[model samples]
Target: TIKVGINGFGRIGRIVFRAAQKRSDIEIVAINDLLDADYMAYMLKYDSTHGRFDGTVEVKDGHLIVNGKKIRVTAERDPANLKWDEVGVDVVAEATGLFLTDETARKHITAGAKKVVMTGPSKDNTPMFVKGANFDKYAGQDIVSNASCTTNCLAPLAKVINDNFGIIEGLMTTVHATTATQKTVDGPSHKDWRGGRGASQNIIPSSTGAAKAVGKVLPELNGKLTGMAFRVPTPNVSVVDLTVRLEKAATYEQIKAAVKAAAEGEMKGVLGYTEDDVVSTDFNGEVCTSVFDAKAGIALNDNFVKLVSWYDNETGYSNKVLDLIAHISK
Candidate 1:
């Protein structure tokens, strides 16, 4: 089994822990968070978005116990101080989302981790990986990033279309929900003005790096893709409305068929297809990166086409984090 360490026990971090528990190949060696051990256990036991766990979650002897598994929990705030090597941690998933740059990520290695897998997208120069898009590049990398949820949802679709029909230009809009970073009520602006407003009160228009990251995964699409986001009031699940200008003219039927075939073939586990009338909450704990609306894909005017896809941003991304951890361990 590959021993794993978690550096942050926040939203993504806790989900990673929950998901890791179901994986036989992984062992939770250590967890570092700023919260008290009891508080961490409380948060783990009852997640507002994911709901309560069926299994017991208890804190004893300054460690977390879940479903008969005991794992070390620490309140360390600094990555340089974590004793990962001493605990035999093979890889560390840095889910704090606070450390996205390579410079900060490397500190986990200095703290004695064999490998560091970032739970969010990385800044430029550092490798930003999306499993279905560019996971093969992970072979020799030590510090890798599992790009953002939207990127994970967009990359594979972009790749399949670009490979088959070729893309000229694309515009994407991710209807995302308020994250933990946003304030629940009106608050002072730290830097972003929109982010400071009440999350439940607005359909906040924000920026997204998903298109930019997609370009990195499929370099040929650089400068040809652009995207923005709308942070809605929903609790979970997000949708990506991608409108692409294909190199060749295609019918709605042909485009839908291609996407369906791709989802079942090349993007099997990473992407799912559906024709049912489903809403956001319908995909609460889904593991796939993207779920296409098989009936909603439409070809606009000849070369222009639109595709709508859904994803359980938290659960899906947490699953990718585990998948990447397994890949790194191998």
Candidate 2:
């Protein structure tokens, strides 16, 4: 089993813990956060968005007790002080959103984690590995990133389309949901103006590096795509709308065939397809990296196409993180 430690018990960190329950290969050995063990147990037992976890959770003598297993819990301000060595944590999930640089994130390695996987894109080019895009490129790296949630939702689709028909260029727009970074009431967001607005009450426009980020995972598509985001007033599940010019002329049927084949072939669990008329809420606990909405894909003038995919920003990504840990451990 891969004994993993969660460095930040935030949304992604908590979800990773919950999702690992289903997999026999991944085990969460310890967690380090600013919050105490009792509060972490409380938050894990009752989540506002994903609903209550279907298991027993409590704190026993400062250790988190979940489903009869006593998990090590610690409150630490620095990664090097988290005591991962005591628990023999094989990998550390960097879910804090604070440590993206290889230099800063490497402190976990110093604390005795064999590997560190940042939950988001690295500020500096620490190799990124997307399961459906370039997971094969991961060669036992000490520090790597999973890219962003937006990029995770886009990578699978981009890979399928670009590999099948060859993308000339593309524009992506992710209608993302709100996160903890946004405030409950209007206040200063430090540098971002739109982030200052109330999260649950606003539809904020923002920038995304997903387009450029795609190139990092799939090198052939470098500088071929550009995109942004529209942060909607939702808590979970986000969708990607991409319009692209294909090098090879293809119809809607052909595009569908490509994605459908990908969903069943090499990209099997990483890519999905659906004909049901669904909305963001339908993907609340989805595990697929990207779910193609058949009703939303369109081909204009035989070469220009628009496609859509949905992802559970928290649930899907957390599962992928565990999957990556399992992969590296093997």
Candidate 3:
């Protein structure tokens, strides 16, 4: 098993720890957090929005129980301060939500991690990675970002659209989960402007940089993608409303077949496809990258189409965190 180190113990970090524990090829060997609580304390107060495992995770000394194995932790919060090499971590998944720039990720590498993957989108000079599209390019790279949770949903959707009739352009609106970034109660708008409203009551209009990352992942689309975000009431689970202009005439049957074929087998198992007439909660605990709405595809004209895809932003994207670790190990 690959010894993986996870930075930060927040929503994404903890979920990634749980997901990595479930895999045979990976084991979370080190966890970095400033919290001075006991090791079980980390697992006990698991993030409520993200699903927790059914079994118990208890700590003794600095090691915690995960799938019946004792996992160790370096317990440092600062990336530059951690001794990741001592714990035998081959790669580090920096889910801290702190490192946005290439310089920050390089700090983790200097701390002795062979590679680092951040949970947020790319900023200054970091390479953005979406597993299915560009995981092969990660070899020998010091740092990478998995884009945002929304990018996890949009990447595969764009690929599916492109592989089908060739998308000339695409529009996406992510119905995202309420984040700590949003205000708890409605009042005046914050300095950042768009996320100031209370998440419980408002459908806050905000910008998701998924489109920019989409350009990196699917360069074939050129400058043909744009996206927006709506922060909904839920604490987890996000939906993507995607519209694309096809280069060729295609029927609903052919489109569904393409998506189905894309999602069937292993891809189908991880990247799901569903015609089930269901709601948002249907994707509650999904560990896959996305659940393509097979029944939700609409053929407006011979060359225009719309579809919806669902993802448990935290859980699904965190699973990708582990999937990356598995890939690096192989």
Residues 119-184, model 2: lDDT tens digits: 999999799888999988888888989988888889899988888889999999999989888888
TM-scores of the models, in the given order? 0.97, 0.98, 0.92
For candidate 3, the C-alpha RMSD (Å) to the true structure equals: 2.2
Evaluate model 1: give its TM-score. 0.97
Tens digits of per-residue lDDT for model 1 on 44-153? 89988998886888887757787887778777788988888988898999998888888898888998888889999887477878878888877678998999999999
lDDT of each: 0.87, 0.89, 0.77
Return the lDDT, model 3, position 58.
67
Off by over 4 Å in 1: none
| Clash number by candidate, in order | 0, 0, 1
Better of 1 and 2 by lDDT: 2
Q: Point out the higher-scoring one by lDDT: 1 or 3.
A: 1
lDDT of model 3 at position 66: 59
Q: How accurate is candidate 1 locally (lDDT)?
A: 0.87
